[PDB]
Amino acid sequence: LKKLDAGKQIKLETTQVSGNFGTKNSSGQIVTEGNSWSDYISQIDSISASI
């Protein structure tokens, strides 16, 4: 706190994010529960070039 009130600033860094994607079930209804992105993040990053 003594550092904070003397002018220093707190920086916020996002280490990771989580979230689901949408897909069709046996019916025509979109379901986005249990379809995580962390399963495909590494696989996509391992075979792709970032632009």
Partner 1 sequence: EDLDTDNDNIPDSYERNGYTIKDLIAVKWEDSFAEQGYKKYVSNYLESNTAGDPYTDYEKASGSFDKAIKTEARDPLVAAYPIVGVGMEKLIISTN
Which residues form the interface with partner 1 (CB under 8 A)? 28-30, 42-43, 45-47
Residue with tokens 């495909």: 40
Please tell me the number of Cα atoms within 13 Å of 50 on its side-chain side.
4
Please tell me the distance from the alpha carbon of residue 3 to that of residue 5, in angstroms, as a whole number. Answer: 6
Least CB distance to partner 1 at residue 49 (A): 15
Least CB distance to partner 1 at residue 4 (A): 14
In the 8-state DSSP scheme, what is residue 2?
T
Between 20 and 31, CB nearer to partner 1: 31
Least CB distance to partner 1 at residue 3 (A): 12
